[PDB]
Design an enzyme around this catalytic site. Structure first.
Site, PDB file in Angstrom:
ATOM      1  CG  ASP A   1       7.298  -0.730  -8.687  1.00 42.97           C
ATOM      2  OD1 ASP A   1       7.397   0.071  -9.626  1.00 42.97           O
ATOM      3  OD2 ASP A   1       6.160  -1.039  -8.211  1.00 42.97           O
TER       4      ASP A   1
ATOM      5  CG  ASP B   1       5.298   2.893  -4.885  1.00 37.30           C
ATOM      6  OD1 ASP B   1       4.720   3.093  -3.798  1.00 37.30           O
ATOM      7  OD2 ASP B   1       4.798   2.198  -5.795  1.00 37.30           O
TER       8      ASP B   1
HETATM    9  N1  LIG Z   1       1.252  -1.827  -8.075  1.00 40.34           N
HETATM   10  C1  LIG Z   1       0.472  -2.648  -7.106  1.00 40.34           C
HETATM   11  C2  LIG Z   1       0.928  -2.496  -5.665  1.00 40.34           C
HETATM   12  C3  LIG Z   1      -0.174  -2.633  -4.620  1.00 40.34           C
HETATM   13  O1  LIG Z   1      -1.467  -2.491  -5.207  1.00 40.34           O
HETATM   14  C4  LIG Z   1      -0.045  -1.531  -3.554  1.00 40.34           C
HETATM   15  O2  LIG Z   1       0.701  -1.668  -2.587  1.00 40.34           O
HETATM   16  N2  LIG Z   1      -0.784  -0.434  -3.750  1.00 40.34           N
HETATM   17  C5  LIG Z   1      -0.699   0.726  -2.873  1.00 40.34           C
HETATM   18  C6  LIG Z   1      -1.481   0.465  -1.588  1.00 40.34           C
HETATM   19  C7  LIG Z   1      -1.434   1.693  -0.678  1.00 40.34           C
HETATM   20  N3  LIG Z   1      -2.183   1.479   0.571  1.00 40.34           N
HETATM   21  C8  LIG Z   1      -1.962   2.907  -1.443  1.00 40.34           C
HETATM   22  O3  LIG Z   1      -1.781   3.972  -0.508  1.00 40.34           O
HETATM   23  C9  LIG Z   1      -0.444   4.257  -0.181  1.00 40.34           C
HETATM   24  O4  LIG Z   1      -0.125   5.572  -0.611  1.00 40.34           O
HETATM   25  C10 LIG Z   1      -0.924   6.579   0.027  1.00 40.34           C
HETATM   26  C11 LIG Z   1      -0.528   7.892  -0.593  1.00 40.34           C
HETATM   27  N4  LIG Z   1      -0.149   7.640  -2.031  1.00 40.34           N
HETATM   28  C12 LIG Z   1      -0.685   6.519   1.533  1.00 40.34           C
HETATM   29  O5  LIG Z   1      -1.364   7.570   2.197  1.00 40.34           O
HETATM   30  C13 LIG Z   1      -1.151   5.143   2.010  1.00 40.34           C
HETATM   31  O6  LIG Z   1      -0.991   4.935   3.393  1.00 40.34           O
HETATM   32  C14 LIG Z   1      -0.304   4.098   1.329  1.00 40.34           C
HETATM   33  O7  LIG Z   1      -0.683   2.792   1.753  1.00 40.34           O
HETATM   34  C15 LIG Z   1      -1.097   3.208  -2.661  1.00 40.34           C
HETATM   35  O8  LIG Z   1      -1.479   4.423  -3.319  1.00 40.34           O
HETATM   36  C16 LIG Z   1      -1.191   1.997  -3.571  1.00 40.34           C
HETATM   37  O9  LIG Z   1      -0.222   2.316  -4.571  1.00 40.34           O
HETATM   38  C17 LIG Z   1      -0.448   1.828  -5.865  1.00 40.34           C
HETATM   39  O10 LIG Z   1      -1.306   2.718  -6.547  1.00 40.34           O
HETATM   40  C18 LIG Z   1      -0.781   4.053  -6.577  1.00 40.34           C
HETATM   41  C19 LIG Z   1      -1.902   4.960  -7.024  1.00 40.34           C
HETATM   42  O11 LIG Z   1      -2.614   5.446  -5.891  1.00 40.34           O
HETATM   43  C20 LIG Z   1       0.430   4.059  -7.499  1.00 40.34           C
HETATM   44  O12 LIG Z   1       0.918   5.387  -7.630  1.00 40.34           O
HETATM   45  C21 LIG Z   1       1.495   3.120  -6.895  1.00 40.34           C
HETATM   46  N5  LIG Z   1       2.596   2.988  -7.860  1.00 40.34           N
HETATM   47  C22 LIG Z   1       0.925   1.725  -6.517  1.00 40.34           C
HETATM   48  O13 LIG Z   1       1.764   1.074  -5.559  1.00 40.34           O
HETATM   49  N1  LIG Z   2      12.044 -11.442  -5.781  1.00 37.12           N
HETATM   50  C1  LIG Z   2      11.729 -10.496  -6.647  1.00 37.12           C
HETATM   51  N2  LIG Z   2      10.469 -10.150  -6.802  1.00 37.12           N
HETATM   52  C2  LIG Z   2      10.320  -9.219  -7.731  1.00 37.12           C
HETATM   53  C3  LIG Z   2      11.301  -8.601  -8.488  1.00 37.12           C
HETATM   54  N3  LIG Z   2      10.735  -7.749  -9.412  1.00 37.12           N
HETATM   55  C4  LIG Z   2       9.429  -7.914  -9.221  1.00 37.12           C
HETATM   56  N4  LIG Z   2       9.131  -8.770  -8.200  1.00 37.12           N
HETATM   57  C5  LIG Z   2       7.814  -9.191  -7.695  1.00 37.12           C
HETATM   58  O1  LIG Z   2       6.800  -8.805  -8.623  1.00 37.12           O
HETATM   59  C6  LIG Z   2       5.903  -7.855  -8.002  1.00 37.12           C
HETATM   60  C7  LIG Z   2       5.506  -6.801  -9.007  1.00 37.12           C
HETATM   61  O2  LIG Z   2       6.671  -6.023  -9.274  1.00 37.12           O
HETATM   62  P1  LIG Z   2       6.564  -4.415  -9.258  1.00 37.12           P
HETATM   63  O3  LIG Z   2       7.803  -3.832  -9.914  1.00 37.12           O
HETATM   64  O4  LIG Z   2       6.460  -3.962  -7.835  1.00 37.12           O
HETATM   65  O5  LIG Z   2       5.301  -4.010 -10.117  1.00 37.12           O
HETATM   66  P2  LIG Z   2       3.820  -3.511  -9.949  1.00 37.12           P
HETATM   67  O6  LIG Z   2       3.946  -2.612  -8.795  1.00 37.12           O
HETATM   68  O7  LIG Z   2       2.869  -4.683  -9.669  1.00 37.12           O
HETATM   69  N5  LIG Z   2       3.384  -2.712 -11.298  1.00 37.12           N
HETATM   70  P3  LIG Z   2       3.681  -1.139 -11.682  1.00 37.12           P
HETATM   71  O8  LIG Z   2       4.977  -0.861 -11.104  1.00 37.12           O
HETATM   72  O9  LIG Z   2       3.568  -1.102 -13.352  1.00 37.12           O
HETATM   73  O10 LIG Z   2       2.524  -0.338 -11.268  1.00 37.12           O
HETATM   74  C8  LIG Z   2       6.684  -7.354  -6.771  1.00 37.12           C
HETATM   75  O11 LIG Z   2       5.728  -7.019  -5.780  1.00 37.12           O
HETATM   76  C9  LIG Z   2       7.394  -8.621  -6.335  1.00 37.12           C
HETATM   77  O12 LIG Z   2       6.400  -9.545  -5.878  1.00 37.12           O
HETATM   78  C10 LIG Z   2      12.594  -8.964  -8.315  1.00 37.12           C
HETATM   79  O13 LIG Z   2      13.575  -8.483  -8.844  1.00 37.12           O
HETATM   80  N6  LIG Z   2      12.745  -9.937  -7.352  1.00 37.12           N
HETATM   81 MG   LIG Z   3       5.533   0.567  -9.563  1.00 35.61          MG
HETATM   82 MG   LIG Z   4       5.174  -2.439  -7.091  1.00 29.78          MG
END
Ligand SMILES: NCC[C@H](O)C(=O)N[C@@H]1C[C@H](N)[C@@H](O[C@H]2O[C@H](CN)[C@@H](O)[C@H](O)[C@H]2O)[C@H](O)[C@H]1O[C@H]1O[C@H](CO)[C@@H](O)[C@H](N)[C@H]1O
Ligand SMILES: Nc1nc2c(ncn2[C@@H]2O[C@H](COP(=O)(O)OP(=O)(O)NP(=O)(O)O)[C@@H](O)[C@H]2O)c(=O)[nH]1
Ligand SMILES: [Mg+2]
Ligand SMILES: [Mg+2]
Ligand SMILES: [Cl-]
Length: 298
Positions: free
Chosen positions: A212, A193
């Site tokens: 993450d 990711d």
């Molecule tokens: N945890 C919260 C983070 C935040 O919501 C975020 O950035 N959320 C993410 C926003 C993105 N725009 C979404 O799309 C992202 O991945 C797509 C393919 N997977 C790309 O084509 C897209 O171009 C990219 O943009 C992405 O899927 C979202 O990911 C989140 O949801 C996914 C399920 O689809 C999980 O697998 C991820 N661990 C989690 O980050």
């Molecule tokens: N500065 C800083 N921010 C952090 C750190 N760990 C987490 N964060 C903050 O907390 C947010 C959430 O952390 P993250 O591991 O990405 O979790 P999530 O993606 O929301 N959830 P999940 O991974 O269970 O789907 C990050 O986007 C960032 O804002 C760290 O070590 N340092």
């Molecule tokens: Mg994650």
């Molecule tokens: Mg995250």
């Protein structure tokens, strides 16, 4: 807002006997998780029963593997507190300090600063991708096979009620899935990711930490370039990922791009599937709408 924080303060203090919460605030959230900054020093990632069953368990195993085996100055979470049950998971670790990389920040960096950041990234990915992953061999992910299983779930649930345009988008993706070769290359441990909202910079704009690793596993090497190659408002841009790929070396750039393009085409279907599995109609609607947006863009 006050109420979430009180509940999580209580749970932290209850499950971690000697831990005292003097301050707590929400620092981020996902669809089914919330992260908190506690005592201005600890991150606590928390989740109530989802489709994890073993969600924060794997993530914790991956931090433990990486903290044992990585040789790098780049910091990653180091878990000091964990509570893992079917209904509730909590991971706590010391907050890595720094500033998240964004496109705006990147554009203020000199060319040399940009180069050094790209090199740092390439270096971290080379070191992680090169690890002997035997001791974490449970964390294998086969994306092609996952897509096939998700397609079957679609066929068993809502596929027959989709529109022709929706069906065609899906079938056209499956046909491309079946013709591609991009899942037949090197497998390795990937962050999986690897977007710029998970990359931290220090005061000199150098890479200081990565967070993450919740989706990490043994998967196609191409996976960790999907966001570096992405052209969107949240990511730096295709050139950034290309340059990093050249620095990383020994990888077919055109296939990395094909892999990103296929993953991007899958997104609306991934969204629909997430809605089915988690009984959230809103995601099903969003994914279907997105199929129309993409179909009509050209
Ligand atoms: N945890 C919260 C983070 C935040 O919501 C975020 O950035 N959320 C993410 C926003 C993105 N725009 C979404 O799309 C992202 O991945 C797509 C393919 N997977 C790309 O084509 C897209 O171009 C990219 O943009 C992405 O899927 C979202 O990911 C989140 O949801 C996914 C399920 O689809 C999980 O697998 C991820 N661990 C989690 O980050
Ligand atoms: N500065 C800083 N921010 C952090 C750190 N760990 C987490 N964060 C903050 O907390 C947010 C959430 O952390 P993250 O591991 O990405 O979790 P999530 O993606 O929301 N959830 P999940 O991974 O269970 O789907 C990050 O986007 C960032 O804002 C760290 O070590 N340092
Ligand atoms: Mg994650
Ligand atoms: Mg995250
Ligand atoms: Cl719908």
């Amino acid at each position: 807002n006050a109420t979430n924080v009180k509940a999580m303060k209580y749970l932290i203090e209850h499950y971690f006997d000697n831990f005292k919460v003097d301050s707590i605030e929400i620092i981020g959230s996902g669809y089914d998780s919330v992260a908190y900054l506690v005592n201005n020093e600890y991150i606590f990632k928390t989740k109530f029963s989802t489709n994890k069953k073993k969600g924060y368990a794997k993530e914790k195993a991956i931090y433990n593997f990486l903290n044992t085996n990585l040789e790098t100055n780049v910091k990653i979470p180091n878990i000091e507190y964990s509570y893992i049950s079917d209904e509730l998971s909590i991971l706590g670790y010391k907050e890595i300090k720094g500033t998240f990389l964004t496109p705006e920040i990147y554009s203020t960096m000199s060319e040399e600063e940009q180069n050094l950041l790209k090199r740092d990234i390439a270096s971290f990915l080379r070191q992680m991708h090169g690890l002997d992953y035997t001791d974490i061999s449970e964390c294998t992910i086969d994306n092609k096979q996952n897509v096939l299983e998700e397609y079957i779930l679609l066929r068993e649930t809502i596929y027959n009620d989709l529109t022709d345009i929706e069906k065609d988008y899906i079938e056209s993706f499956m046909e491309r899935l079946n013709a591609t070769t991009v899942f037949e290359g090197k497998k390795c441990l990937c962050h999986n990711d690897f977007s710029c909202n998970h990359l931290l910079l220090d005061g000199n704009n150098r890479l200081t930490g990565i967070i993450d690793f919740g989706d990490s596993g043994i998967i196609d090497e191409y996976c960790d370039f999907i966001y570096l190659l992405e052209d969107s408002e949240e990511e730096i841009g295709t050139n950034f990922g290309e340059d990093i790929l050249r620095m990383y070396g020994n990888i077919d750039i055109e296939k990395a791009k094909e892999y990103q393009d296929i993953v991007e085409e899958y997104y609306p279907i991934e969204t629909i599937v997430y809605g089915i599995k988690n009984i959230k109609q809103e995601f099903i609607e969003n994914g279907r709408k997105e199929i129309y947006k993409r179909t009509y863009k050209d």
